[PDB]
């Protein structure tokens, strides 16, 4: 099984061809080399903003696989299939959908964790550092997985702190706290 | 025909049993309304009309029970057979 | 001992509406700044309960 | 003073820790958010927003865990945080709640601060099994003289009381509570029955009326009233006799008694079918929801006379329902009816003809029978239900010149029919049903005038109290009549009548 | 171990996705072992790629998604014996009657197929009764399914009690009353009276066995009770041999349970809010319900009236298959007759003169006629007056008063109720009493004589009694 | 997107390895959501229209529905014998 | 919608002094009157009736409000509220209007009702 499950609304069948790429294992680099094929996708976007655009039948298919000649090859046979599939299916808005979605397969098998601790207002980078390192020093980080937090701002995220990793927070705003304190005072 | 029934401000009910009793066309007034009403009405025409509504008022109760074909009470009949007329 | 509940839920709403003022003198203050250190510290000891 | 120590409490909560599961909305519209998270999560769990609003989690679905909000959306919006509280909804239980009006969380709405609750039990638990119930051997009075002894009622018993809409259905209801404050006073805690309303979509206003009255009566001190009023939200009003029960569950395991009154499930139908069609959940017969069938019936399983090794206790319950018009067709009304154990259907012509209560006891019957009827009650009130009977068929000989005999019936019929009148928000004692059923019963209230009835009634019993008010402690006490009793009541009635 | 992890718990419904390998088959029995109770789930759908969707037998309140889940590989199955009989048992198969592990000795699986075109009897035999009105105008058929008609306790427990001592006796039958949409505390009742009436006799013997299926069960156990006790049935016919008497209570709430079922499931309710698959459900439980060559399963079921819409489709499917209806009134309970079963309202599709016996029908036509001009005289008799209408007007309604009292039999299971001895009066002495009555050979015996009385014989003793 | 078996992520695995259905499964098919008395096949793209197939599990279904990329056989046979 | 403890409940008598309406179906200030009726029974006109008696008598200020009603109605009632001075544009009114209209669409229709609650 893919290593996270991510209910795969249509880009989870290319998660269940990642699978494909541990079983073939040489798929696994090919989610690299796919990262890289996406990267040529960030570089389409002129042309991606026309592959939006609809109604390319055996055409478009045709169109898609020259594109695929001005690649390399990132992501090979396994990334061709999803070309024709895709191409199949007619859908160049979930084309980056499926990019982003094997990236976090990828990444999972990996074992790179995304956290984040939003807040009012930007955090320091010694503060960054020392709860990367509380959370490797905890059982959520625990070690053998990275982690990227990202302090994110949102004053609308009241003062005092949230910190967020898995289905896991830490929810130390003001809001919170202010709430409790009037309730208990109406009481 | 309820939602245009409360947007307008009259229904002309018509009745397919008295068109057939011989009014052509036939208006059953019983669920016809002008809530507007008589200031759209010509003054001679208002007055004339005044107790038209009232005769034929007890005229609809009067003949409902008079079909039986008893001989009833002769106020009820002067309804009766003034409401036929 | 109806106006006794009464002038107890009087002097609830006025301490009430006082506490309002508070919270809006805190959220100015550089109180506002000094305690997110607070708040990193204080989770900083939590987490590392775990 | 309270308040210095309110927020010194206050600040002695401030203790926080990691929480094991969040979920973030990923879209809220039409109460039913789509949550993304909450992996672990238990199965109908209570669930706290970042707006602090409850829900349940009906559908766990793989992709999105559908939480039902149990209040508004206005404080709802996207990405919010929901805190996992890891608890299956529950509500506090325990004898705090006796004289105390709570809303249906459990949160007071009298606001008498925190309840005395020695256990928070879940809102649905399964019902009694075969063995852990036994059969009904006390009755329960309503203080209305028809009402126990025409219909007579237990403790244990499911019976409707299906009738019209408003026509002081809350208040034929009522009258049971106060009759049952006399009981309550007494000692014997199957004698305490610590009763419920549940007022299920009923305005503020009504409850304030209710609760006004439940003072004067000084009712409130065993009371409860778990209130889902007319604004509050049809999930809250779905759970709220669901809850309720739980509540008393802990009353009835405990070996006491207690009467739950669910007011109405009418609406209670209404609520449910709302949520189930905002689930998408299918309609079913008359556009209601077909396992409403389903959920009645668990409901109604909650009241019952528990077996001795599972303590003599008991829950007895009356649902009440609201008839369209006296349509008992209603698939609300068929199903509730075979579930439950006889039906009370008052009678709204009478009800409009004046006769308060107003119940016809051609359309009221009682399958808990005369085990649940008083043994005294019983004997002078085998001829009160035929006498009516006759007072019913014959009524129609009188709408023509006819026989004496048919006459003779009609002066007992009627006398009968003017003494079972009593103006709503007085009850009696049973000491004092038994005499006034034994008069008319003797048929001597017949040269009483119709006028002088009323009269006859309150004399007759101060009367008895003058002259023996020990023959009222000993029908009370003996619960039967004996031959001297019913010896030295012919005599007084007649001493009574005479004048 | 065939296992998988919860993937869904979507109402009652619960997707479960089992480690790629293990290909459920449908109607497969899950257990999940969970700490409070054991949950059953019942494989309704293989929904691919080694998920399925499944019903529930007991509430999924709390389940977490990813609970391991073991599958037994087919439905349930419930142990079979005489040891059963006597026990109180739930759709599970386990002990509710609170005696302790019933003693379980061959188990067989809930689900199970009706016997073949070959193994059903081409000839419909009839169950012979001891009740007398049973007997003549509405005789059980053996296999057959008696729908019983009438409402709560107009008489239906007592009924339902004469017919457990009588199965004993007519065959050495056994029983197993199934209740569907049971009151629990009506229940208690039922297992109180039955255990008094000796029918059930926990220290003694037990004829009965007992399912019952409460209303507070989800709707998934409401329609695999009734399933349970069949296959309970089927080991005492096929392989006991037995002819056994099968009680179900309400047949409304089979479908009711069927219909919620069948919407959360997805299956579109056809109408009057009814199960699409409302036909099947009947047929396979209804064909079940047969003579084999070894023995046969005779069923009485209640049916509960919808809503008086008899045109419903399902009463009407129900009805199909019926082969006798037995219409009790309250009212022929109040003219003091117990049995308090209507005969003009008594029926049976078997009543036909090959089936019944040539004179077992023409005394019944007989009967019906007399009775019925007894009913139609009796309406002018009182009007326009006994003498001031024909001799023989009221020579019928004699005749006929003297059958009416004669069909009140003080029966063995309400011999308590009524005082007087129980009455058991095999069929064949019913058609020979019949005879005499008919042949008013004893139209000089009161009608007080043929009150409360079993066969003709006994009723030359009673007028005796009444003179002497 | 609609049920076609790129959303079958097993059938779509196989083909975003490079394998198909390669004829094979244009005249035999494999059986996927089978219950409701109703099953869905992959592939049978030989198929005649009312076509009767056999089932391996002695089951026989008139094929109704020729849907792009699957088939949905009618069962003429119980849910139980298949899989 | 206020609380349960916000609730202080009792009920004063209102006088239409309208005989009937007074002895058959006293109206209580405070109360939730409910007008039942047909199309045009004079439903409008009972209304001004009340606005007529009831209001001028009582000190109080009340707020008319229509949902969906006709802009001929709305004109007359306009009008006929200036005519009995009840609205004066000059001068004060013991009466608010908030007109709401048909063809508006049913979502504004929805909410005028909110809108003359909250004054």
Not at chain 5, 147 to 164: R, Y
Not at chain 6, 2 to 7: I, L, R, S, V
Request: contains cysteine; glycine residues 8%.
């Amino acid at each position: 099984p893919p290593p996270v499950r991510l209910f795969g609304v249509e880009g989870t069948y290319a998660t269940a061809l990642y699978q494909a790429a541990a079983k073939n294992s040489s798929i696994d680099a090919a989610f690299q080399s796919l990262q890289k094929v996406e990267s040529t996708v960030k570089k389409n976007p002129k042309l991606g903003h026309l592959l939006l655009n609809p109604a390319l039948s055996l055409k478009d298919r045709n169109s898609v696989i020259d594109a695929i000649v001005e690649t390399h090859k990132n992501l090979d046979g396994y990334v061709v299939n999803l070309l024709k599939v895709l191409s199949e299916n007619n859908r160049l808005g979930c084309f980056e959908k499926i990019a982003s979605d094997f990236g976090v397969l990828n990444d999972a098998h990996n074992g790179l964790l995304k956290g984040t601790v939003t807040s009012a207002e930007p955090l320091d980078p010694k503060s960054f550092k020392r709860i990367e390192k509380a959370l490797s020093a905890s059982k959520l980080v625990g070690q053998g997985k990275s982690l990227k937090l990202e302090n994110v701002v949102k004053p609308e995220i009241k003062g005092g702190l949230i910190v967020e990793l898995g289905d896991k927070t830490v929810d130390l705003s003001i809001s919170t706290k202010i709430q409790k304190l009037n309730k208990v005072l109406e009481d | 025909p309820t939602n245009v029934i409360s947007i307008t401000d009259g229904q002309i009910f018509l009745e397919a049993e008295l068109f057939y009793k011989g009014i052509r066309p036939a208006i059953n007034v019983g669920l016809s309304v002008s809530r507007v009403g008589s200031a759209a009405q010509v003054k001679a025409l208002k007055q004339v009309a005044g107790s038209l509504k009232l005769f034929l008022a007890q005229y609809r109760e009067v003949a409902a029970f008079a079909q039986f074909g008893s001989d009833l009470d002769a106020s009820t009949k002067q309804t009766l057979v003034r409401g036929e007329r | 001992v109806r106006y006794e509940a009464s002038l107890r839920q009087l002097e609830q709403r006025q301490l009430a509406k006082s506490v309002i003022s508070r919270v809006q003198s805190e959220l100015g203050n550089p109180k506002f700044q000094e305690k997110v250190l607070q708040q990193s510290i204080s989770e900083i000891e939590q987490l590392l309960s775990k | 003073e309270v308040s210095s120590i309110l927020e010194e409490r206050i600040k002695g909560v401030s203790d926080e820790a990691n929480l094991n599961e969040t979920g973030r909305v990923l879209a809220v519209g039409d109460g039913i958010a789509r949550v993304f998270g909450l992996n672990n999560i238990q199965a109908e769990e209570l669930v706290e927003f970042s707006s602090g609003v409850k829900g349940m989690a009906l559908n766990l679905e793989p992709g999105q865990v559908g939480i039902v909000l149990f209040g508004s959306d206005r404080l709802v919006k996207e990405g919010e945080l929901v805190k996992r509280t890891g608890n299956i909804v529950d509500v506090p239980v325990g004898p705090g709640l006796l004289g105390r009006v709570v809303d249906a969380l459990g949160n007071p709405i009298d606001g008498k601060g925190p309840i005395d609750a020695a256990g928070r039990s879940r809102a649905q638990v399964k019902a009694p099994g075969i063995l852990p119930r036994r059969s009904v051997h006390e009755p329960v009075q309503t203080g209305l003289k028809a009402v126990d002894a025409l219909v007579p009622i237990g403790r244990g018993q499911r019976e409707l009381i299906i009738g019209d809409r408003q026509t002081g259905k809350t208040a034929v209801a009522l009258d049971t509570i106060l009759n049952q404050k006399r009981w309550n006073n007494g000692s014997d805690e199957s004698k305490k029955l610590y009763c419920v309303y549940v007022a299920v979509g009923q305005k503020r206003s009504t409850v304030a009326q209710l609760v006004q009255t439940l003072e004067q009566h000084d009712a409130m001190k065993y009371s409860i009233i778990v209130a889902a009023t007319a604004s509050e939200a049809a999930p809250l009003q779905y759970l709220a006799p669901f809850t309720a029960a739980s509540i008393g569950e802990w009353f009835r395991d405990n070996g006491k008694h207690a009467l739950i009154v669910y007011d109405d499930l009418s609406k209670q139908a209404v609520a449910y079918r709302q949520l189930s069609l905002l689930l998408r959940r299918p309609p079913g017969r008359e556009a209601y929801p077909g396992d409403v069938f389903y959920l009645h019936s668990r409901l109604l399983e909650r009241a019952a006379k528990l077996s001795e090794k599972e303590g003599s206790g008991s829950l007895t319950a009356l649902p009440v329902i609201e008839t369209q018009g006296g349509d008992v067709s209603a698939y609300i009304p068929t199903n509730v009816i075979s579930i439950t154990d006889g039906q009370i259907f008052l009678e709204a012509e009478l009800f409009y003809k004046g006769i308060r209560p107003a119940i016809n006891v051609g359309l009221s019957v009682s399958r808990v029978g005369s085990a649940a009827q008083v043994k005294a009650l019983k004997q002078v009130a085998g001829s009160l239900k035929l006498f009516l009977a006759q007072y019913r068929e014959v009524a129609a000989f009188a709408q023509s010149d006819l026989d004496a005999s048919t006459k003779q019936t009609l002066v007992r019929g009627e006398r009968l029919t003017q003494l079972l009148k009593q103006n709503q928000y007085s009850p009696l004692a049973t000491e004092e049903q038994v005499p006034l059923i034994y008069a008319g019963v003797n048929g001597h209230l017949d040269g009483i005038e119709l006028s002088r009835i009323g009269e006859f009634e309150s004399s007759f019993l101060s009367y008895l109290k003058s002259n023996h008010n020990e023959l009222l402690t000993e029908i009370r006490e003996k619960g039967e009549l004996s031959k001297e009793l019913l010896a030295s009541l012919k005599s007084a009635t007649e001493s009574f009548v005479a004048t | 171990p065939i296992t998988g992890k919860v993937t869904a718990v979507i109402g009652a419904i619960v997707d479960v996705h089992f480690e790629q390998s293990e290909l459920p088959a449908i109607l497969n029995a899950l257990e999940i072992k969970t700490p409070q109770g054991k949950l059953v789930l019942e494989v309704a759908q293989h929904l691919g790629e080694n998920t399925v969707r499944t019903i529930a037998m007991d509430g999924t309140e709390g389940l977490v998604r990813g609970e391991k889940v073991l599958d037994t590989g087919g439905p349930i199955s419930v142990p079979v014996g005489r040891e059963t009989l006597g026990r109180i048992i739930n759709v599970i198969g386990e002990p509710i009657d609170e005696r302790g592990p019933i003693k379980s000795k061959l188990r067989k699986p809930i689900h199970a197929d009706p016997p073949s075109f070959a193994e059903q009897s081409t000839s419909a035999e009839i169950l012979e009764t001891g009740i007398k009105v049973v007997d003549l105008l509405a005789p059980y058929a053996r296999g057959g399914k008696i729908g019983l008609f009438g409402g709560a306790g107009v008489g239906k427990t007592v009924f339902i009690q004469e017919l457990i001592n009588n199965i004993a006796k007519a065959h050495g039958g056994f029983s197993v009353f199934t209740g569907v949409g049971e009151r629990t505390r009506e229940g208690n009742d039922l297992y109180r009276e039955m255990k008094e009436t000796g029918v059930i006799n926990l220290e003694g013997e037990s004829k009965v066995a007992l399912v019952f299926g409460q209303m507070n069960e989800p709707p998934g156990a409401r329609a695999r009770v009734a399933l349970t006790g069949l296959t309970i049935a089927e080991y005492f016919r096929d392989e006991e041999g037995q002819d056994v008497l099968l009680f179900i209570d309400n047949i409304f709430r089979f479908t009711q349970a069927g219909s919620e079922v069948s919407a959360l499931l997805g299956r579109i309710p056809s109408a009057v809010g009814y199960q699409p698959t409302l036909a099947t459900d009947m047929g396979l439980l209804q064909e079940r319900i047969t003579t084999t060559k070894k023995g046969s399963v005779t069923s009485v079921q209640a049916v509960y009236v919808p809503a008086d819409d008899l045109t419903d489709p399902a009463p009407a499917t129900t009805f199909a298959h019926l082969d006798a209806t037995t219409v009790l009134s309250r009212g022929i309970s109040e003219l003091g007759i117990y049995p308090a079963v209507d005969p003009l309202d008594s029926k049976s599709r078997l009543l036909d003169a090959a089936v019944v016996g040539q004179e077992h029908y023409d005394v019944a036509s007989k009967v019906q006629e007399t009775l019925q001009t007894y009913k139609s005289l009796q309406d002018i008799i009182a009007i326009l007056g006994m003498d001031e209408l024909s001799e023989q007007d009221k020579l019928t309604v004699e005749r006929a008063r003297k059958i009416q009292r004669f069909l009140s039999q003080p029966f063995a299971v309400a011999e308590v109720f009524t005082g007087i001895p129980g009455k058991l009066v095999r069929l064949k002495d019913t058609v020979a009493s019949f005879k005499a009555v008919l042949e008013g050979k004893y139209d000089n015996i009161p009608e007080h004589a043929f009150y409360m009385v079993g066969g003709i014989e006994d009723v030359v003793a009673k007028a005796e009694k009444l003179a002497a | 997107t609609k049920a076609q078996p790129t959303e079958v992520s097993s059938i779509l695995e196989e083909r975003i390895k490079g394998v198909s259905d390669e004829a094979n499964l244009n005249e035999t098919g494999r059986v996927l959501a089978v219950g409701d008395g109703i099953a869905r096949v992959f592939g049978l793209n030989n198929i005649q229209a009312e076509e009767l197939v056999e089932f391996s599990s002695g089951v026989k279904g008139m094929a109704l529905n020729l849907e792009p990329g699957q088939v949905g056989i009618v069962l003429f046979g119980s849910d139980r014998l298949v899989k």
